[PDB]
Amino acid sequence: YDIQAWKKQCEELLNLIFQCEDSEPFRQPVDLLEYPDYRDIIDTPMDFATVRETLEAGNYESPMELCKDVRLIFSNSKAYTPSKRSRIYSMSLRLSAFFEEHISSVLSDYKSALRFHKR
């Protein structure tokens, strides 16, 4: 029932994501010089360095906020891809499966701890 445990759990999961080769396109903001029409398609950029920095600054209140920004990484990749077969999009789908498999217990434990707190 530890209401604060989610934060270290999210730090450890971001460390695994940075070790995965599939994360490399998503570690830093998309390069607008490589992709000059990016902002004509994507309204809100997001990357794993920004997520990590927001967490370490104390600017997430809950793991649900962090999950919403990680899901935006994946939805931007799906919106920007020219093909469902593209290399970078294909990397996003494997990394999304790994994230969703690991975040499920973080969310469940946090929401259980808050219910116990308000009992």
User: Which residue carries 């460390």 as its tokens?
Assistant: 15
**Should residue 22 be labelled a site residue for ligand Cc1cccnc1O when binding is judged by CB under 6 A?**
no
Q: How far is the CB of 19 from ligand Cc1cccnc1O (least distance, A)?
A: 18
- Stretch in the footprint of ligand Cc1cccnc1O (CB under 6 A) among 6-14, 24-32, 55-63, 111-119: 24-32
- The site map against ligand Cc1cccnc1O for 42-81 (x = CB under 6 A) is -----------------------------------x--x-
CB 75, CB 26: distance < 8 Å: no
**Should residue 41 be labelled a site residue for ligand Cc1cccnc1O when binding is judged by CB under 6 A?**
no
* Residue 43: burial class (beta carbons within 10 Å; 0-12, 13-18, 19+): exposed
CB 13, CB 52: distance < 8 Å: no
